[PDB]
């Protein structure tokens, strides 16, 4: 018949290949598909939904595992005290590991885009105060005081009727994409740091609680993209199931 | 899609259509 030749790529089973195979059921018609609400057409559609961030990931015991979702705030001596810090690296293990964005990003090697962190105040109605949230780009170490942190991009948050403010972390980088950061050589892709400072005080009249809590929600902007699919770093089994 | 048989479910995956509706889950407010 027709003379052919075989190239040195035959008989190999490649997992990611797209190929044609012989069907097992000739002339088969599946069940019709009715309309079911809530269809996903892209993993990026649900990469922009805010989820609770675990900034206060100090405790570990079983009975206090719920305390990791908020961090406390109270009255001080008005000297610009520090509240909490963390690293703004979605793929690196840390506070971001508790969000849907953090879990999904583990399936993709490289990402690019702007993030967004929202803080909500859950105190009494008569408690007022202001806070400063600062984002230090790469190169600068952790700020030692407020007057050093105010140099980078920052936003001043005022308590009031509107109880939520959003700090947008703009995409500032040297490369078009960033790989996942880790300790050692791969610190080249570190995004920076986030700090929260007392602005004036936490003022409260008589007969009202002295301690309040803040809840932080994180998500991604409209230019967030990921590529180069890989497998996750965590396996949820310890043998046969 | 490339197909060599009489059944449509034996073809390749092909290229989908790039459409997004982020407002379905992020902004469901009336």
């Amino acid at each position: 018949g027709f003379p052919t030749e075989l190239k040195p790529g035959t008989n190999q089973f490649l997992t990611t290949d797209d190929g044609v195979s012989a069907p097992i059921l000739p002339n088969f018609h599946p069940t019709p598909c009715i309309h079911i609400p809530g269809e996903v057409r892209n993993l990026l559609e649900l990469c922009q939904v805010e989820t609770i961030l675990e900034v206060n990931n100090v405790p570990t015991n079983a009975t206090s595992l719920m305390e990791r979702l908020r961090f406390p705030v109270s009255a001080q001596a008005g000297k610009g005290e520090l509240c909490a810090v963390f690293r703004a690296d979605p793929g690196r293990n840390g506070p971001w590991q508790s969000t849907l964005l953090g879990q999904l990003c583990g399936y993709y090697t490289q990402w690019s885009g702007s993030l967004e962190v929202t803080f909500m105040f859950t105190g009494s109605f008569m408690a007022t105060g202001k806070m400063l949230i600062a984002y230090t780009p790469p190169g600068g170490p952790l700020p030692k005081d407020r007057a050093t942190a105010m140099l980078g991009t920052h936003v001043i948050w005022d308590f009031g009727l509107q109880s939520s403010v959003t700090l947008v972390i703009p995409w500032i980088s040297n490369t078009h994409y960033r790989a996942h950061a880790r300790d050692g050589v791969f610190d080249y892709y570190t995004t920076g740091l986030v700090s929260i400072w007392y602005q004036t005080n936490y003022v409260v009249p008589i007969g009202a609680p002295n301690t309040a809590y803040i809840i932080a929600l994180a998500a991604a902007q409209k230019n967030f993209t990921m590529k180069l699919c890989k497998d996750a770093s965590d396996i949820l089994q310890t043998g046969t199931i | 899609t490339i197909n060599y048989y009489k059944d449509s479910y034996a073809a390749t995956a092909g290229k989908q259509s790039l459409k997004q509706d982020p407002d379905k889950f992020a902004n469901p407010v009336k």
Binding site: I34, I36, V49, M120, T122, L161, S163 | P28, K30
Partner: protein, 224 residues
């Protein structure tokens, strides 16, 4: 303008003066089964006014050390009202739901709730609801921090005192039985614990109200 609200359906009415708008689940209002989706051959019954109205279920107390509660739908209403009677007299059932959660306190209290709806809530190891044992993992091995991906709202005691969610029919079949399948479960978890100083009122009840919308039944038989 989205601070006062009135919701009326059937012969019941709900008013609130501190609202947080209305969340429509997955951006789709409830509707009836179209002629192309149907599979039954018998004409269904639509009682309309007699089963689409607000029902009040039970009251649960909020304490400084509470864990959380969850309910199941439509298991709660099978012994309540004409909706209950029709559910046991018919085999196929479909409907939507409008859910309203009420919890109010003074200006000197503080705390926050997480109201969410999770379809097909399989629980690992009635109308009065149950109390969670391991709220961190939702009693099913999934973290609670990602619950916001589901239709949800918050009850912040300094901002509002109510939450409203509208959920259409969610299932892979046009009709299903109401006595063997629970489409979704409602969750109410205190994320920020309640706090007040001695002398204030220490009872902060939580009450649940809900109303079926666009109900349908088919397959008449004896009551089971």
């Amino acid at each position: 303008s989205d601070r006062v609200a009135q919701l009326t359906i059937g012969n019941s009415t709900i008013t609130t003066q501190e609202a947080a708008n209305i969340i429509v689940g997955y951006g789709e209002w409830p509707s009836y089964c179209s002629d192309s989706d149907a599979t039954a051959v018998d004409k269904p019954t639509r009682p309309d006014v007699s089963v689409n109205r607000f029902y009040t279920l039970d009251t649960k107390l909020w304490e400084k050390s509470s864990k959380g509660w969850y309910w199941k739908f439509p298991d709660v209403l099978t012994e309540t009202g004409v909706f209950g009677q029709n559910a046991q007299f018919h085999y196929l059932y479909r409907s939507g739901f409008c859910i309203h959660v009420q919890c109010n306190a003074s200006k000197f209290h503080q705390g926050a709730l997480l109201v969410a709806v999770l379809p097909e809530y399989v629980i690992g190891t009635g109308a009065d609801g149950f109390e969670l044992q391991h709220p961190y993992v939702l009693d099913a091995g999934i973290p609670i921090s990602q619950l916001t991906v589901c239709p949800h709202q918050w009850i912040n005691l300094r901002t509002n005192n109510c939450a409203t969610i509208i959920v259409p029919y969610i299932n892979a079949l046009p009709f299903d039985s109401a006595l063997n399948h629970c489409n979704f479960g409602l969750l109410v978890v205190p994320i920020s614990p309640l706090d007040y100083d001695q002398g204030a009122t220490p009872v902060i009840p939580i009450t649940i109200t809900l109303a079926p919308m666009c109900s349908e039944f088919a397959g008449l038989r004896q009551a089971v």
